[PDB]
């Protein structure tokens with residue numbers, strides 16, 4: 244083939260930043276396999292904010308285009324709903340497009356009390372994108388859990404995922420700094436999947452929660468509730484750390500888990516995170532592929548040829 248679990252592809256961190264891509268449509272047209280978005284749920288008032296730093300309104304390249312004819316025409320700095328609108332417009336204009344993973348960092352976690360929890364997140368994505376999403380319900384099928392499904396049968400072929408979006412969730416830097424014991428994005432969303440599954444409602448889910456932070460063994464052992472563990476089939480961590488000798492990355496490949504390796508440029512010997520040479524970047528992607536990455540991410544927006552790279556995972 245390959246399948247979504249046997250390939251290595253390339254992502255762009257903070258793809259909503261105007262400095263990288265004038266419009267979000269440009270991020271979508273970059274060829275990248277993974278585009279990362281920073282969302283805020285605990286700002287005041289309505290909407291999920293899109294912003295790198297503490298939001299004042301939004302700071303993004305998203306336009307909220309109503310259709311493809313409107314892409315690259317509107318004022319930017321739109322919110323998550325606006326981003327999703329751009330995605331839908333672009334999707335409708337590019338039937339059979341490459342599968343794209345939207346990696347969402349929930350900067351400040353969820354805000355269920357304020358109407359921005361896992362259920363409302365799913366509902367918004369369903370409203371905007373509908374059938375274009377490949378989510379946990381799709382992967383899991385009739386299996387008891389996502390883990391059971393993925394280990395036994397793996398992911399669909401890349402060809403079969405044409406015209407699909409997938410979503411990954413990681414906890415954010417702000418909730419990592421909370422002195423209180425509010426549940427983090429990972430436990431909250433995984434618990435949501437567990438609860439949906441118990442209610443026979445997994446089909447309405449839209450995103451895969453990831454275990455964030457490179458670790459040896461089975462990283463899911465960090466969760467004291469074993470019932471949450473099989474809802475994590477995506478792992479996200481520092482590339483240099485994954486390559487430092489302490490972690491057996493073949494484990495992920497054998498089990499068909501998705502492995503996102505961040506800051507790919509910081510793997511020694513370090514190369515530029517934005518403007519490396521094409522040769523340097525390609526070599527780095529190949530190195531990470533051999534080390535069983537599903538995705539290698541950095542800021543290589545100047546290198547769309549590299550961003551489009553898809554190679555076999557694990558040699």
Ligand SMILES: [Cl-]
Pocket residue numbers: 246247248249396397398399499
């Ligand atoms: Cl697979």
